[PDB]
């Protein structure tokens, strides 16, 4: 149960951005906070981690998780969030649950952050819990696939 | 501990709503989950809930918060998330850590839905996971209040 955790432009840089809104937190911050709340719940998660500036490269990593390695996606499509029909036409097309995370509220900054093609394209959003929202992602994905394969066994068996 | 959870309009009509959009739930089921969320994981939560279909009364219980029996807020406005400055200016006031749920993606729906006054005075927003981001929401909320309190003794002494 490889969870894909897809991060995009500027991320890797967290701790050199505005502290007002992103904090003194890391990337690499962030994914320890999520093993560990993995590791501790005791979850049969295993979190893949990829980081990049790159609209296609993200297109990229969600194609290649069509293949049956990956159940789900976590993704902070960041600033492309905005911007790329691409990621958003990638993302309907998975087949699998992607769920799109911010660790700021993207109702309350610049009014060209507002609108997220990409989270429209995904079942669910979160926004603005900072590095705490990636573990709800993480708790919410979990939940998910239980459903739907507990549902998948309910109709193969009728 | 109390949690105020407020509800907004013909949110209590659940089940009589389109369920394409909104599963075959109904407020009070949504309501127990909550419980059965808090009496499992052992969280020393009481919750309260609140529905209403006026947004002066949203705007009273928020008020009514501001008094020491309650430490945070789980709001979903509903329709009212994106017409009311009145409730957003609410929240504002509150002095308290407020959690904005959607049920349903308001990114994916009506153009008069993409935008949330509330949710950009929120801390947080979630959308799209159903009755489970209130659990979310549950989660999220525990997490902030244990740290803005394990911050607060962590300034008080020195």
Do not use: W
Not at 83 to 112: C, W, Y
Not at 143 to 156: G, R, S
Request: charged share 20%; proline share 3%.
């Amino acid at each position: 149960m490889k969870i894909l955790v897809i991060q995009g432009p500027n991320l890797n840089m967290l701790g050199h951005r505005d502290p007002r809104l992103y904090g003194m937190v890391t990337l690499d911050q962030i994914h320890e906070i999520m093993q560990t709340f993995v590791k501790q719940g005791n979850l049969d998660v295993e979190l893949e981690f990829f980081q990049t500036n790159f609209e296609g490269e993200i297109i990229d990593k969600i194609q290649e998780s069509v293949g049956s390695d990956y159940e789900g996606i976590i993704i902070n499509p960041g600033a492309f969030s905005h911007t790329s029909i691409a990621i958003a036409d990638a993302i309907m097309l998975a087949g699998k649950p992607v769920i799109e995370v911010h660790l700021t509220n993207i109702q309350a900054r610049e009014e060209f952050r507002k609108n997220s093609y990409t989270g429209a394209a995904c079942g669910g959003v979160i926004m603005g819990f900072g590095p705490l929202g990636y573990n709800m992602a993480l708790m919410a994905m979990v939940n998910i696939l239980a459903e739907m394969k507990a549902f998948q066994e309910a109709q193969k068996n009728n």
